[PDB]
Every structure is written in C-alpha cells, then in structure tokens.
Design an enzyme around this catalytic site. Structure first.
Site, PDB file in Angstrom:
ATOM      1  CD  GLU A  18     -13.963 -54.231 -10.714  1.00 13.72           C
ATOM      2  OE1 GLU A  18     -14.248 -54.731 -12.072  1.00 13.72           O
ATOM      3  OE2 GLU A  18     -13.960 -54.510  -9.456  1.00 13.72           O
ATOM      4  CE  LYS A  63       3.712 -59.903  -8.045  1.00 15.97           C
ATOM      5  NZ  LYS A  63       2.225 -59.543  -6.805  1.00 15.97           N
ATOM      6  N   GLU A  85     -10.796 -65.052 -11.004  1.00 17.57           N
ATOM      7  CA  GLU A  85     -11.914 -64.357 -10.079  1.00 17.57           C
ATOM      8  C   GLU A  85     -11.829 -62.746 -10.399  1.00 17.57           C
ATOM      9  N   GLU A 117      -9.193 -57.517 -16.833  1.00 19.14           N
ATOM     10  CA  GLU A 117      -8.081 -56.920 -18.268  1.00 19.14           C
ATOM     11  C   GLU A 117      -6.669 -58.103 -18.061  1.00 19.14           C
ATOM     12  CB  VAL A 118      -4.346 -58.331 -15.268  1.00 18.71           C
ATOM     13  CG1 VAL A 118      -3.168 -59.410 -14.720  1.00 18.71           C
ATOM     14  CG2 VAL A 118      -3.501 -57.227 -15.602  1.00 18.71           C
ATOM     15  CB  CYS A 143     -14.795 -58.944  -6.270  1.00 21.38           C
ATOM     16  SG  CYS A 143     -15.650 -59.998  -5.324  1.00 21.38           S
TER      17      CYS A 143
END
Lengths: 481, 481, 481, 481
Positions: free
Chosen positions: C385, C177, C252, C233-234, C286
C-alpha cells in the site's frame, strides 16, 4: 384559494364555502367548494409528478432535506400557524404551539429520517435451477403512488402532517383534503412545503364539503391509497369503494377508550389521571377515555375528587388567559354532544358535574360533564362515541369483570390501567382487546410508536416503522446467471 | 367428507356434489355441498379454538413442531397424495410429487421456522411526562384471528399450504375452502394436520360450490382476514365486502406476464425459455408468460424453434409414461380456453402451432398453441387471461416500445427479460410495472421470496417476511412508571 | 487549544507541537502535545457525562436535533472549514467544500435520524415456567459507553464525522484523537458541536503525537470501544490491547483495491474509470484502485489513454485555480511514496507516466505515476500500500486468473469490475474476496452503505445499519408473572 | 476417538487421556490427547469444506434440513445420550433428558429455521454519479469462515449445540473442542451430525488437555472466529491473541449474579426462588444467583425457610432415584469449591446450612451451603465465582443500596428482582448493570433470547437474532449502470 400544481387556484365553479371561528361563531373566511373537476386536476397533477423523474429519482437525502427544511419552517412560522389553529379550531393557543406546531415539526423530522433508510432484502432461494447456474434474488422497496389524504377536524395541522410527512418520505405524492370545518392550516402547510423545496404537484390541497370532494377523491382511478380518519361509518363507505377498486386503505375510525383504576392506586393520582384522559382537547380525541372504571373500594373517593377537578375547569376562548378548555369545532358537533349529554340524564345516570347550560354567550361551548353509573345500568352512552367532554364512571368488583366490560365495545383502540401491580397490569393488558394500552398514562402518541385499533376502530397502523410498510410496497427481482 | 371440529362431518342438508378425473371425464367421487349452516359451524369452531388457551398460549416451539411434523407426513404419505392430485387435477405425476407434495413440505418447514421468531419492538419515547417519571414502550406481534382461506384449482395441495402454513405459524386458526373442481388433497391435508398434533378446530375444511360456500365464508362476522386467489373479478366482490366489513384481505388475482427477448440473447435459449414460461402447468399459472416479445432481428429464428418445441409436446393422462402435458381441470375451463384460441384465429393472428382440435378422445385436453402477432396488432389474446397453453408472440424494435407494451396491461404480476446486458436488464426492470421480474428465468417461486402483483393483479404480498406482516398485527404498550 | 469538559484547555505539560501546510511546507500553527494526564481528564469527563442524567435520559428527538443543528452549522460555516482543510491537508478547495464539509453534513443528517429509531425486540418464549405462569421477554438497545475515536489524516473533517456522528446518535459519548498531521478541523467540529446544543463532556478532543496520546486512549479502563483507522500494523497493536481489555473494537486498516477491465468494456471509459479510481484524493484513500488489470485484447489501448490522462494532471496548491491534484499530507509520507516509486523502477516495471521528479518547488508533491507491469512479475509494489498516486497496470487472459490475482492480496477491502456482462460481473463478484465491490464505478461511499473489508483490512463494518449494531448493544429482560 | 474429515482418527502421537465418572471416582474411558498436529488437520479440513461448493453453495433448505434431521436424531437417540451425560458430567438423568437432549433439539430446530431467512439489504444512495447514470446498492449476508468452538464442562451436549447449531445454520464450518473433563457427548454429536447429512469436514471434533489443544486452535491462521466460554481469565488470553490476529471473538466468561427480594414479596416464594436460582445444576452455571439480597424486614423469615430447603436436598449419583443434586465435574473443581466454603467460614460468615463435610463416600460431592452475611462485611465470597452450590445471603435497607451492591461486582451477566411492584422492578432494572435481568424467575434461557454480559463477563451476545449477526457478516455491492 387551493393548491394544485404549484398554483393557487379557485374552484372551477367559482363556488365557495364558509369556515368559522368556533368561539364567537362567525365567518372567519371562505375557501373553495371544490367538486369533481377539481379533484381531478389535483389528482392528475400528482400523478404527473410521481412519474416525473425529478421526483421519482430524487436522491434520498434531498427528500430528507425538504422535510427537514419545512419542520424548520413550521417552527419559524409558528406563532402565525398557532394563532391560525386557535382561530379555526378553538383550541388553546399554547396547545396550538406545542401540540400542533411543535409536534408537527417533530413528526416531520422523524419521518424525514426514514427517507434515507428504506430497505428491501437480499435473499437465498432453493429453486433449484439447473447446475452451472446461479441466482441472486432481492426485493426493492418502492412508493405506493398517489395518496388520497382525508383529515379530521380536531387537530388540523398535526393530523395532516401525520399523513403527508410519511407519504412524502416514501416518495409518494399526495392529494390532501382537510375537513370542511377546518381548512386553513393545511393551506399554509402546502405553501411552506414549496418554500422548503417540494416540487409543484407533490402536495395538492383540495377543499370542499365532505359529501362530494371526498367521494371524488376516493373513487379516482389514479389514487393508489386512501388514508382516512373520521366517522367510523363513513369509513365503511371508503372500505367498500377501496376494495372493489383494489386500492390500499388506511382507516382510523372511532373509539370508546376505557380507563381502569385498580384497588391500590392513589385516588388523587387516579382522578387527575382520568381528567387528563378525557378533558384533553375538549374530549375531541379518538382515544379519549370516556369510560371510567374504578374499583368498588375507592370509587367514591375518586369521583368526588374528579368532580372537583372538572368543576374548576374554566371554559373560554382559546386566546384568552385563564382558560383551560375551549369549544367544539362546529355547531353540528356541539348539538350532537349536547344530545348525548341529554340522553344520559334520561337514561338515569347521575350528573355529578356538568350539564347542558351554556358556559358562554357566544360559541360552541360545552361544560365538562361527568355521569356516575352506579348501579351498572348500561345506559348506552357507554356505547356512544361523543367526542366531547363527557365521562361515564362505573364501578367494579373483580378484575375479570372490568376486563369484560372494557371489551364489551365495538371499538378497540386504546385503554389505560392505573396500578403499581405488575402481575395485574400485565395480565389485564394480556386480555384487553385494545390496540394501544397505556399504564399510568393515557393519550400518549409518538412518531416512533405505532397506532391503530382493533374491531370497529379501523384497519392498519399509523406511525413508527408501521408507516413505512403502509406507504411502501416491494417489487421482487430474481436474476438467473 | 368435510372437517369441522376434529370431526368428519357431512353437510347438514345432506346434499353433495361431484368431483371428476379430468383425464377420463368421469366422476371420481363426491364431497359435501355445504351452505351457510356449515360455514357457520366451521367458523365458530375456529373462533372457539383461537380463544382456546391451548392454542393461544401454546409455546412457540410447539407450533413449530406441528408444522414440522406435518411436512414430515406429507413426505411420508407422498406417493398417495401425489396419485390424488394427478387424479383430481390432471397434473403430471412427477410434478405432483415434486411441486405439490415436495414444495409444500418445503413451505411448511420454512414457515414453521418463523413461528419461533415473531417479534415486536422496544422503543424510545420523547413524550413527555413529568420529570421523575420514566417510561417503557413496546409493540407486541399478535395473530389476526380466524382466517378465511379460498384456494384455486391449479395447485390444490400447494396453494392450500401457501395459506394454512403461514397462518398456523402465526397463531391464527383457519377455515379453508378448496375449489369445487378439486377438494380431495386439502381433505387429506386436514387429517394429516391432526396426526401431526394440530388441535381440533384449528384447521377446518368446508366444501361446496363457490357461489354460496364462498360468500358465507367472506361475509362471516367472525372471519378476521380473507385470503383469496382466483378470478380477478370475484376478487372485486371480495374487496367490496371485506372493506365494509373492516377486515384484512389478501388477494392474488389475474395476470398476463410478458416475456422479453433482447437482441443478444441466444435464440434457442430464448425459445426453450419461452416454452418453459408458458407450457409449465399447461399454462395454468397466474404468472405464465403468455405474451412473448422478441426483437426484430431474431424474431423468426426464435419462433421457428419454439414451434418445434411445442409441436413435440405429447398430451396425455398424468399417470402415463411419455407424456409432457396433461389436461385442463374442468370442462368449463376447457371450453373457455378453446374459445380464446378461436377468437385468436378470427382476429387474424398466425397459428404456427396448436389449435382447436382435440388431441385425445376423452378429457379436457388442449393442444399447446402459439399465435404469431407479426404486424403488431392488438388482437385479443393479449388482454385476456387464458390460463391455458396459449401464447401470442409479437416483435419489437426499440426497448422503449417493448416496455410500453409490457405495461399496456391491466395487470402487473410478473415478467421476464432475457439478456446478458446488465444495463438493459436492470433498466427494463426499472421501468416495468410488474411485481416480480425474473431475468433469464420465469415462474420461480420460493418460500422466502415475496410475491404479489400491481394493478389488477391484487392487493398484498404473500411469502417470505411479507407473510408474517400480513398474518400478524401489533398491539402497543406504554408503561408510565 | 483542545477540548475537555466544555473547556478550551492547554496540555498540562504546556508542551506543544507543530502542524504544517503541505503546499508550502511551513508551520501553519501549533496544537497541544498531550500525554496521559490529558487523555485521562478527557476520558473521565465523558464518563461523567455518559452517566449524566441529562445525556443518558435525553429524549431521543433532542439528540436528533443536536446532530441536525450541527449539520446546519457545518454548512453555514463552510467556506471557513473548507479553507481550513485545504490549508492543513492540501486537498483541493472544491473538494473540501463538497466532500468534507458537504458529505459531513450529509452523514450527520443521516445518522441523526437513527437517533430516534433504535429498537430492540419483543419475544416469544418456550420456557417453561409452571402453568398459570405467563412471561414477557424483550431486549433493549443501549449505548456502548465511552468511545475512543482515532482518525486518519486523509479526510480530517469527514473521517471524524464518520465516527462521532454515529456514536452520538446512539447515546455514546466520545473522546476523539485526530492525526497529528491534521488536528484543526476536528477542533472546529468540537466547538460547533457545542453551539448546536451538545452538552459539555460529550465530545472531547485530545491532541498529540500518535505514539503516546493514542496509547493512553486505547489502554484506558473507562474506554468502552476503540474505533481506529490507519496503518494496518498499528491496528494489530490496538487489537491485542483491546482484546485483553475485553473492549469492542472498530478497525479500518489497509487496502490494495484491484480494478478489472473485461474484454467488452470501452477503452476510453475504462481509462477514465481507472484514473478516477486512483488519482482521487491524490490516491490517499484506503480503497484506491492501485492495481489495474486489463484484458489482453485492449490492454495497450487502455494504458495509452490512461497516460494521456495522468500526464495532463496539473499538480499544485489547493487554493490555486487550474489545479487537479494537490500534495501529500506530510513529508514522511511524501518520502515513503517516493521510495515505492523508486522500488518500482528497480523492480523492472515500465514507467509510462510520472516518476520521482518534483513537480513543484516547495511542498510534498508527487507526480501521478503509472507502472506497466507487462510480463507479469511479482514486482512487489503489488503488495505494498502506497497511499499515493501510484498505479501498476497488469494484463490478463482468462477471468479466472484475474480473480486469482485480485485475491492474491493480504487485504480485501474493495474492488471494481468494468463490463457490461451480467453473468461475468455478478460471478466475478461471487468469487472476489473483497468487502465492497463496485461495478462500473469505484470509491463510492454512502451514509447508508456499510463499509468494511476482509482479511487484513480490518474487523467490522462502518455505515448504514451496520453502525447502529456496532455502537449499540442490548440488555435482555424476562418478567415472570 | 476424534473426528476429522469424516474420519474417526486417533492422535498422531498416539497419546491419550482419561475421562472420569464424577459419582464413583473412576476412569470411564480414554480419548485423544491431541496436539498441534491434530488441530491442524482439523482446521485445514474445515477450510477445505467451507470452500467446497457442496457446502458453500448448498441450497438453504438443505442446510435447514440437516439441522432438522439431527434434532430428530438427538431425540431418537436420547436415552443413550442422556445416560452418557449423567455418566461423564454427574448431572441428574432427568435433567440430561430434558435440558441436554431436549433443549438441544430445540435449539437445533430454532436455528435451523434461520438458515432459510438470512438477509441483507437493498439500499438508496446519494452519490452522486453523473446524470444519466443510475445505481443499485445492496449488502449480502455471508458466512464468517472456520469456527473455533471451545465448550465448558457444565452442560456438554447443550453448550456445544449452542455454538455448532448457529454456526452451521449460517454456512460456517466448525472445529469444536470439548472440555477435557467431558468429551463424549460431543463425539456422539459429531457422528449423528453425519447421519443427518452433514458433509465430511463440516464439524470436526478435536480432543485434548486445554493448555495445548486450545492454544493451537486459537492461534491458527485459518480460524476465522473464536467462540469461547469458561474461566474469565483464560478469556483474556484468547482476547489478546484474537485481536492481534484480527479475528472475531465470542466470549462468555464469569458471573456473580445477584438476586433481590423486595419488601412485599412472599417469603416462601422468595426462598423457593433463591434455592432454584443457585442449586440448579449444582450451582454450576455462569448465571447462578450466588449473591442473595433480602430486605431487612423479611430477611430472617426468608433465610430460615431457605435452609429448610437446602437441608433437605439429597446429594447422590445421577442415576439413582430420590436424588436432587449430583456432583462436581472434576476433582480439581471439587477442591476449589471446598476452599471457598472454607475461606467463607474464616471470613466470619454464618453457616446456616451445609459445609465442608462429605455427603458421600466416593465422588466429587459437596453439600449445598448457605452463608449468612449479616453484618454486611465484604467477606469477598461475594467477589469470587464459585461455580458450586454456595450462597451468601446479605440484607438491605433501601433499594438504592442494593442496587449499588449488585453493581459492586466485576461481572454483570444476570440478575433477579422479586417483587410485585412495577415501578421498583422496572427501575431496578433501569439501574442494574446486568446483561440479562429476570423478574420473579432466574436462569431462564431461550433459543430466541439473546444472552451476554457486561464488564468482565464477556464480549458479545449469543442467541436469538444476535447469533446471526455474530456468525455472519456482509459484503457490499454497488453497481453503476
């Protein structure tokens, strides 16, 4: 002309030597008869280039891509290289396309992927330096140096990939000497190597009679490893020389692979099994199963069928249709193979299939021959490596008996057990002194499967993850901080 | 008396030879002067036992437990083995206890650990065989066979462990020959091996003059590997012999380790560094840093301090208190070390410390000697391995020049860089042709760190995970089902 | 359209959703708005195919070839895929060609070479069966199953090849996805996968809003592993779900990479260093080094230079010439990035460069912003972030306090030290709680380097030889005979 | 009492709970009923110590020696620990001495040798930084952190070693919770750990009811990994919790191991085979072979013999002579095992051996029970893990059907094939969805053999070289110089 430094070059003496077509037996061409002048240039050129920063410090996906682009060019140039082999070697064209052009491309790919995965270790260490101190310690995989590669004549393209592919992956440069009976496919190899992006000097090809070109290569002070395959005797010569030289040595020497048919195995499968084990590549294979051992119960059943199989092999040119086997590679080997057939008739074995009668009018052709050793007389064709299509088939009563006979050889490279008996199969393999046992097959080689023999069949292992250890070494680094 | 088959046995000729104390140049004792009769028994006894089902098929935690039990008995018997070394070798008692009794026990433990963890691989296969015929491939790690182990005289207990420990872990049996100047600690080793549960024949110890016992061991048809350490010359003899024999060979030969002090390195931390690099084990160490290279800027500063350090070393017996260095191991080596000191004075180097005069009244004692090669002349204390406490200290302007000088040697075993400079340290290590670089240390050896040299310093690596690859081999197995 | 079973298929509801162009913020196109109907087909199709004999029992050089041909087709189709990225993502065209088309091809090649080198072990065993009872024990590396792959929007082509490349090497099939802000390059990926010889069903691509398509994928009973990258979070939603499901999970999540300039480092190099560490990929990375720590001594020197560097960045369309940075990927992220800039001005930091004003007229553009946090306030932009071009630059006196500050984060993904101090550099690295430290660089990723973070930055490692262990598992086999 | 910080400590509430003897249903003793106060101290104490330099930076042969000295103290204290187990667990004394004291010592030794051999890699890199800049990149194996260890009640000493041994090897510290039905042998373990040289805090043992002590341990913010074994249900609870926590999880949950007897296998070997497969440890074994599948031809022959075998098992106390099986561990499990026997009689299976009647007068004793499922009804005694001595024996006609039945389970932990057919055996193993197949054995576990299951039997692998990947992780380091 040969290749030395990106340059197609002839011999400094301007001396030359004939290569032949083993089917007709005539000159196919000429190639250079190089001597110690021209091993020297070639070995000084690889040492030039190994130190060049452009090779030493070539990023690791760039060396993977050269080997990738050439596997892609062995297959794109593959009808021509396959006609070439068949011409020079005698081998059946479809097998040139499949097992020389196509297995060669497969080994490149495989080893090309190692180029990028070569690792050392990162270590603990109980030293133990003074306090307030710390240390970090590692090993670093590095290349061995200049590689002297000497190739046998039974599979010229492949057996040259089998060394250059893994040496180049590693960051080694190579000086390659093909057999004198077959130099053409390695010459093409070398020029496709450069079309793929290999820098000049990274792969040199020197040509010549084995007696002198070979020796010069071995005894060169700037050659770092010697990878030889051939006569187990000449391997001794290389051994001695390499060891007083303090150089690494790869040696794949002779075999007398036994093949063992147990009581429960099907007779049609066993005899189809044995024929494939010894008439593959006209028996010109280190691992060819030249000793057949079948149980007492089904012994005759098996050798009956087997002679039907070998009687029906059609011997001919490698480019003709309807042909199953081709010729020997040279006329000296043809003559040696026929002398062994002949000692075997005098030593009292039963010729069930074959003889010394020439199947053709021109060429180095031998008929596929089977000798039955009923009566367990150790004719000593049970000791002789033939390297031709000759089988001795002996019987046996116990399994302990056959195991003993399999390991009454000075060689130890391969072996087959034919059986659906788990215990036996696994416990024969337990007791065999063979470096690569097959069960219900023979002659199976892969880029990922290590290969080597025990005893008089050599020193070292060839493929897989065994390649990497033999074409690399490590340096240690310990930092006190 | 020597060990062969669980049996304390004398030589068949009844002939014998003297060992000495090197401190009070006197006979300490006698041991067997074995010949080719008694290498024979010993090598036929290990081959008996390698084929033994007890040893071959000994579960793998049982072989781990023997090596564990015996590290536990080196340490329980450790005052006695440490007095023994000091007696025979000359070495300081505390270093016998720490670096011979105690580092050995550490090696055992470590290698005892890999007994249990020896693995092959399980592999894919793109073959291929007919459809509806699937295969399984694997390799199986197996032992090499009977091990011929020849040990040097500088660290008798340890150097012996360094071989037997890893060979026994693997399932190899060994025939061990200690130097003729030092046999006693390996004799004790062998009998503690049996107290720990090692079966008779698994470790035999043959004793004798190197010229003949050695040769017999090397040239034995049932010896499978040769692990030698000593004179780089004799290593060449072993090489030749081993290679025509088709046997595996481990060779740890000479060195001339350089040590490099860069501009920014503290100057007393360099001179304390160099002294430890070359007066450790009275310089009797393959890796001893016998060439000192200090930058132009702090060169004098460094060698001034260094002579304070070496002037203050007290030479004496190994069991006396207040002593920092002991003797040479034999009177032939003492005489050779003194001849090199002496060629160095004639070759025009500056004696800033040490010399040819005898520190003591009895014994094979040498004063720690430093030669200053101001003027950067290639005298011959630079290309000759002394193996004694002798240093040549030369200066240098660029870093490229020092690197070149470090690799103007016929050996590449070890090296040191002294620096807080990341780039330089790492890029010197990049360009050095040395098999084990240290940074801000020297002479550091672990059971987990591989060890070996480049060029004329040998073939092969010794410890860590390099020891298993050198004391094991593989057999392949491919089952068609 | 989306891909499911070799088929270009629309969503079952017929519902659809808009993708946009970040530079002129208008519809670029539409793609399927898939729901739990169409995750299901796609996941039942990969499970069909994983069990497929063709795919399960595909020889291992055939799976290596597919991945090789498709690296060969990313590069042959590479102007088009690079225009595509730039269109959808906003990224500079050259970077699309180099870091998305070209690094993606490099990752394929690399992982394609592992397809053929996947091994288990062959083991010893202290059991202990009866006597006369011998056993052989191995592990066999096998694939994990159907892979649920969820990809982030900052590097659409590459981040997808990061997951599919290693899953397909292994023999896993995947359901991929892509982010909803960027689906086009994975759609092209999927159809080139099939041109390269990948069987239908092996790589399905489902598209849709993250809320629902995502959930369906995660909570599917036939999904064997979940590889997610995105909001930390997700990731905890996925965690919970995956763990009660007993499925393997790759995660990650977020970072707040610090970058540390020590006293001795050059100011021009440090500020060029920091700018590259955080304005690469418009800070949408990241590992972007969003916290700058410079020593007291050269702090101002460094941030002066740095604002010259960021002031001179030209922001614009990705296909325009003269442009150095492009846009944010979506308007929600643009708005979030601007809210953090704004929080930062209110929290009392010094805007030395950039701000909140719009550089362009159309699009999701942000100016590169630097905040000087002199006075060391926990201006809580040091905990957030951003994922945009925003830097906070703080000073420091002792190295112990910078280390503390670096590890006063809830993340621990990456970090940089800039220095030429060996002791300090290694020792800082000793004490950092970061999963991938760089020294005198930042943002460096290889196919052979494992990647992952500590703490709140995820679970697991990503590349190299860490991939294979996360995309494979083993089965054990112990045979008594 | 319990151990926390080197300190024998009671619970903070002063609350306590009873442990029992399973043979004579009586209190044996009391232990702490700890709560979230005392999980907290214990987990803060291990985190204190993990950060301890004493433990973090303990040389690696010192951590090998602690585990070595405590295997040496498991065996020196081994009559007492074996009486202890038998007392608390019910297990036969000789099996306590052999499989709990003695296998535990073996596991220590083995894992203690991996303390010394923990390595990362040293890597190549296609970056590609500017020219003139070279780079060196490595990974470094590091410990995971504080380990939450929850142990099952069937093998209290061993199952505890299974976790602590590999965690301590790695440099992890642990907080261990034993089952509430069996805490005593882990308490002794912990104090022998300290006698062996383990620093205070490195191994804490918390005790208590599973409902609360357990939860507290799992949900602790400073616990880095959770290693659980028990009810597959509770494992889900741990999963969910661990995944939203972003912590590593080891889970060894339930099994319904099938055992398969092919046509050619000998009936008395098969029935002796099956009995050992399911009456070992009173059937209290994850991998116990609780489903028997025998071919149609010899089905009755086999189950006849088998009932002779189970009829003749004598059930009794673990310290009595003449006894073959002992009791269940608790009265709740005894009652659950008897309810399953009873549903099995109602579901129409044939009781050929055993039943629901009590063999003894006191204690949690069950008779060994065999149910014959002729008629092949999904009675669903096959779907329920019993964990007691209960077997269902079903027949089968073709090999494809048995394979299907073996993989009609929700768990796939182990399996057996009994045969001497190589094709079939290998192939059966090909198609089984079981994580550890045995051939002509069952229940065989090594320290070097990885162990784990598929499906609902858990996540992860346990021993061997799988341990050291699950109890370590890596950090990457890339230096630009």
């Amino acid at each position: 002309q040969m290749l030395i430094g990106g340059q197609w070059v002839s011999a400094q003496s301007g001396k030359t030597l004939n290569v032949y077509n083993p089917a007709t037996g005539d000159i196919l061409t000429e190639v250079p008869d190089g001597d110690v002048e021209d091993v020297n240039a070639a070995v000084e050129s690889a040492a030039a280039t190994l130190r060049s920063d452009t090779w030493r410090r070539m990023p690791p996906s760039a060396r993977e891509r050269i080997l990738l682009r050439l596997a892609d060019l062995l297959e794109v140039h593959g009808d021509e290289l396959a006609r070439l082999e068949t011409l020079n070697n005698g081998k059946l064209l479809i097998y040139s396309k499949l097992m020389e052009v196509g297995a060669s491309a497969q080994w490149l790919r495989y080893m090309a992927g190692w180029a990028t995965k070569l690792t050392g270790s990162t270590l603990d260490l109980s030293l133990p330096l003074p306090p307030e101190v710390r240390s970090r310690a590692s090993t670093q995989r590095v290349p061995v140096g200049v590689v002297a590669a000497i190739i046998p004549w039974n599979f010229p393209l492949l057996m040259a990939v089998w060394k250059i592919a893994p040496a180049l992956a590693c960051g080694n440069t190579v000086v390659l000497k093909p057999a004198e009976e077959t130099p053409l496919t390695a010459l093409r190899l070398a020029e496709l190597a450069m079309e793929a992006g290999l820098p000049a000097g990274a792969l040199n090809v020197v040509t010549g009679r084995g007696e002198t070109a070979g020796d010069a290569l071995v005894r060169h002070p700037k050659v770092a490893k010697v990878a030889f395959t051939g006569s187990t005797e000449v391997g001794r010569i290389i051994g001695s020389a390499c060891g007083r030289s303090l150089k690494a040595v790869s040696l794949e020497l002779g075999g007398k692979s036994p093949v063992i048919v147990l009581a429960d195995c099907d007779p049609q499968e066993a005899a189809e099994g044995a024929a494939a084990a010894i008439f593959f590549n006209h028996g010109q294979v280190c691992t060819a199963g030249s000793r057949l051992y079948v149980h007492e119960s089904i012994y005759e059943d098996v050798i009956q069928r087997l002679a039907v199989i070998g009687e029906s092999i059609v011997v001919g040119s490698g480019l003709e249709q309807g042909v199953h086997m081709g010729p020997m590679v040279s006329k000296k080997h043809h003559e040696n193979v026929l002398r062994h057939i002949r000692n075997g008739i005098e030593d009292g074995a039963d010729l069930i299939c074959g003889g010394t009668e020439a199947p053709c009018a021109q060429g180095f052709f031998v008929k596929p021959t089977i000798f039955a050793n009923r009566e367990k007389k150790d004719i000593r064709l049970l000791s002789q490596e033939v390297f031709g299509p000759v089988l001795v088939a002996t019987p046996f009563s116990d399994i302990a008996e056959v195991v003993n006979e399999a390991n009454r050889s000075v060689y130890g490279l391969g072996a087959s057990i034919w059986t659906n008996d788990l215990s036996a199969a696994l416990r024969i393999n337990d007791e065999l002194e063979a470096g690569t046992v097959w069960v219900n097959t023979h002659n199976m080689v892969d880029p990922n499967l290590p290969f080597g023999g025990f005893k008089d069949s050599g020193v070292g292992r060839e493929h897989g993850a065994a390649a990497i250890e033999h074409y690399t070494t490590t340096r240690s680094l310990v930092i006190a901080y």
